[PDB]
Amino acid sequence: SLQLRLALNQIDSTVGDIAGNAEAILRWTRHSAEQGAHLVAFPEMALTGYPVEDLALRSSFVEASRTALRELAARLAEEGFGELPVLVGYLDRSESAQPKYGQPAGAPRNAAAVLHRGRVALTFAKHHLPNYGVFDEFRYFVPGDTMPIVRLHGVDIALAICEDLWQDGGRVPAARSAGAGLLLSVNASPYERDKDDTRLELVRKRAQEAGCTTAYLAMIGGQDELVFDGDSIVVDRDGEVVARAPQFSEGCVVLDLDLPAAEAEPPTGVVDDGLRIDRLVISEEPLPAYEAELAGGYADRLDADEEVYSALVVGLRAYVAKNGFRSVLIGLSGGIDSALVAAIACDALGAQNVYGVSMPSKYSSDHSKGDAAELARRTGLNFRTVSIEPMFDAYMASLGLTGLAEENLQSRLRGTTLMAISNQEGHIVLAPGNKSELAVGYSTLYGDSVGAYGPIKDVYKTSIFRLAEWRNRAAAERGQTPPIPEASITKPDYPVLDAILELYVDRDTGADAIVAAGYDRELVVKTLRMVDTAEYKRRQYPPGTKISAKGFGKDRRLPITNRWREGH
Amino acid sequence: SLQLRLALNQIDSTVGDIAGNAEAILRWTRHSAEQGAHLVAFPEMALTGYPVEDLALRSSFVEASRTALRELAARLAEEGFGELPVLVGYLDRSESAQPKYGQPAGAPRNAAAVLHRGRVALTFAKHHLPNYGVFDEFRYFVPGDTMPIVRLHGVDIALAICEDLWQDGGRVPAARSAGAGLLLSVNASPYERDKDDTRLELVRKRAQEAGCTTAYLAMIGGQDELVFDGDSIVVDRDGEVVARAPQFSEGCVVLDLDLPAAEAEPPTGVVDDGLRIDRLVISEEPLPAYEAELAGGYADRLDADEEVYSALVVGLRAYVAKNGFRSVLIGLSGGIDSALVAAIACDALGAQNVYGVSMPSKYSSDHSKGDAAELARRTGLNFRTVSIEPMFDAYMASLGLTGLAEENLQSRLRGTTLMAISNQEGHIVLAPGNKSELAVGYSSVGAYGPIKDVYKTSIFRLAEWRNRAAAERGQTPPIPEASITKPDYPVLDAILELYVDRDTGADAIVAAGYDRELVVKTLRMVDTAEYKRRQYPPGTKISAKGFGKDRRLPITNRWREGH
Secondary structure, three states, X not given: OEEEEEEEEEOXXXXXXHHHHXXXXXXXXXXXXXXXXXXXXXXXXXXXOOOOXXXXXXXXXXXXXXXXXXXXXXXXXXXXXXXXXXXXXXXXXXXXXEOOOOXXXXXXXXXXXXXXXXXXXXXXXXXXXXXXXXXXHHHXXXXXXXXXXXXXXXXXEEEEXXXXXXXXXXXXXXXXXXXXXXXXXXXXXXXXXXXXXXXXXXXXXXXXXXXXXXXXXXXXXXXOOEEEEEOOEEEOOOOXXXXXXXXXXXXXXXEEEEEOOOOXXXXXXXXXXXXXXXXXXXXXXXXXOOOOOOOOOEOOOOOHHHHHHHHHHHHHHXXXXXXXXXXXXXXXXXXXXXXXXHHHHHXXXXXXXXXXXXXXXXXXXXXXXXXXXXXXHHHOOEEEEOOOHXXXXXXXXXXXXXXXXXXXXXXXXXXXXXXXHHHHHOOEEEOOOOHXXXXXXXXXXXXXXXXXXXXXXXXXXXXXXXXXXXXXXXXXXXXXXXXXXXXXXXXXXXXXXXXXXXXXXXXXXXXXXXXXXXXXXXXXXXXXXXXXXXXXXXXOOOOOOOOOOOOOOOOOOOOOOOOOOOOO | OEOOEEEEEEOOOOOOOHHHHHHHHHHHHHHHHOOOOOEEEOOOOOOOOOOOHHHHHOHHHHXXXXXXXXXXXXHHHHOOOOOOOEEEEEEEEOOOOEOOOOEOOOOEEEEXXXXXXXXXXXXXXXXXXXXXXXXXXXXXXXXOOEEEEEEEOOEEEEEEEHHXXXXXXXXXXXXXXXXXXXXXXXXXXXXXXXXXXXXXXXHHHHHHHHOOEEEEEEOEEEEOOEEEEEOOEEEOOOOOEEEEOOEOXXXXXXXXXXXXXXXOOOOOOEOOOOOEXXXXXXXXXXXXXXXXXXXXXXXXXXOHHHHHHHHHHHHHHHHHHOOXXXXXXXXXXXXXXXXXXXXXXHHHHOHHHEEEEEOOOOOOOHHHHHHHHHHHHOOOOEEEEOOOHHHHHHHHHHOOOOHHHXXXXXXXXXXXXXXXXXXXXXXXXXXXXXXXXXXXXXXXXXXXOXXXXXXXXXXXXXXXXXXXXXXXXXXXXXXXXXXXXXXXXXXXXXXXHHHHXXXXXXXXXXXXXXXXXXXXXXXXXXXXXXXXXXOOOOOOOOOOOOOOOOOOOXXXXXXXXXX
């Protein structure tokens, strides 16, 4: 059967940096054309970045998106890629009012276009916009009611965007009745820790369902709280893995495929979900046969610890880099949390760009002071110490604080110290709070409530130990110095606590069901109560890397003012 | 045309306080029945509070709602009110899977029920759950598909909940095609500052469309950033106000109506949106016609400044009280914002429960201290003054900050002070920032921000109104005159209102008459202030379209508005 060479470019866009994203697309297309590619693909919304949020509700950004796509198509042909079809995600809008959905004038569409002959040759838009998920595209977006097909070199190529493939009955069976030979799906899929290979089972099912080879191209990188894992795959007609890209790295997959010829009298008009077939004929004629040397390759998988740790690195790196910043500032208590954050920061930015501050009190211990200095020594960290003891006395003199009030003073001092240093020196403060402390609203003591990014805020304490231990082990595996002091590692209880939180916060099981799983009623009700009342504390917590599907995402929330008590 | 006495109870529920809400519904029913009522109605989601947000998704909470409703009904008759139909809003879940909406059994519903004879005699749930609007029941909730009618003393009374009335072809025409005497709508509508009387506009258009007398009973009170403004209306068949409840007050409307009786053979089956008529009959036979005496009464309308001020008060009062607090702590400079916050707090809690603190630095001016001190005396608040200079010098001794950091240090020092005193004494710190400052990103910390959805231009207007209010009843003007009279703000706020509130673009703001360089600079400032307003405390909303969690921008964002 017919052969074709497809290049899939798993790249990293920056939200709003339209011109810079356009430059990268051009740069990666040239790099693709050199490898003999016949089609070049880029992820969902690659021109604008993702998720773009309320910037989708502005005519100026939509128009900037629209104009730049036209200019990129023209720049492609001017560079001599006018015969080369390039599929690019971008943001568009509906011109008409929408009677069929109930959307006004100029509602945005999550779109993708095929760039050919110095022009925009085809334009379709995401069809399925789910109720669930993180992105509220359902509220505001006009869907595409189109089944986009491209005749290229005798092959019908079907196109889709992300959540299209989540729908039972959408563009996947619509591709079948249109007689697709290759399904090309462009994606921006936020990372989600799961022991299942959710990516493979989705594409497997949908490839057999479409009855053709399915290519799934995904964005990589971090945007605010989210991280895109990459992990692009190609999977064949029978569900077997043709090629697979790495998790959490920029990269290209250029490969040769064997694809069925398209029916010379092909179907037209409405298909499965009510989608009209939008044909575009680049080449009706089959391509001259050539040596199919390239298979794409199966990139090495990451283990559970490595995979999470990588997401954390990419998350933190992107927040720093894409906001203009070079450097971070981390308060060092000698504790396990800060040590893991420092380690993540060194991998993200380089040790030169991470600055540590030890902030001791009069009654703060000597292993606290020591382990911070220890951590500094093994990382290459810019370490310093400033005692909060002088400011403590200054406050205590003209206030006279006792008990709970006087303990809270300590942390606000350290917060102020970190904030003041970063104001002078140009750093971003990192908040050290983990998911366990955040859930129950635990007292920070080193000013966790202060900070601009919280790298481990979605990681349970049980997993913090597991990640630190892996990291130290990862260093030793390659002769490098283990970064985290062992005294930091080895100094209701955490494993039971995190287990109950996982049931309640991530799997949304109630008190009755948690006790039935084998946990003690008193401590269950106490823990849940504490989670519920911690609302206001975590509404005001800094952004950080989300690695779970549901959790403390700003998407779901309890009232602050709330007299409901669980387990009455 | 028949008569019955209708008691509408404009009450304030507390979210999650199901026992306490049931306690309050019982006490208000007592007071309704003692005033000889034939029907008692309560607001939307009254048993539960509103909005409950993610509590709606918990089986434990949903079952606690349903059980309390059954326990309330059974308590009604045990208190000897079993003869009296009482309408209550509450949270329910679907018993069966409804494939029409594709929902599984147990999906949440915003419901209301008629309690009679110690039982739950009729149930129905909201039908229209809009894509737009502040709440998002649209996502999780399953619509009730009935058109409920009550036969009480020969009269057909049709029932609806809030957004049902927003729907063109909703339960409104369905009540006309069912032949209803009275349209009883129970509601929980948040406050929006609008010069138009949108409430009257809605209920007039709908009572005409229904072709009958329509009672819109609304919730009153504060919940987080939302304030419910009460203002219940009754409107006749033709569109004239029969009665009108006060704004921002708990109260009751008890009145008598003239209503058409319905047929001995009334309509049945599918109606307008496919709604099945669910009749409940308490009395088929008409009441012994007697001395019609209660008119209802149209309560006094607040003026624009008073309306906004009441909202701010009710919002603050609720956030203190419902959270088990008694007192607040407000930092005091000379400025207008701190003075107005103090003024609002004193009206909300009593001046005894308001604690002010002046926090002067190395070069803190005399009017700062003077006007702070002034405020305390003409108010009755608890004043104190702690210098931040002892702790400013301790920082600069070991840090040595230049211009950038050392100015910011002062703001953080004051925050630490406020939080420490509140930690010691049990006050809630109040954040003094306004909408104009918050949009731009200027400046701090606290639990509540009473004026955070109020522009600076409106801050003066409200301040001057409050002195004018004091003098109109022979009371001492609370806000110092020098505090009031200390991009320029009115052009700034005009641009912010165009951008933030009316969703107008740069080019169009320029077209409206504003200077391109200033517009661009302002809009740039607003876009980059995102991370600041994300970590800002809650506070009273007065406009549905403004800032909030519904509409937001990315923090990582290299888009720049303007060429």
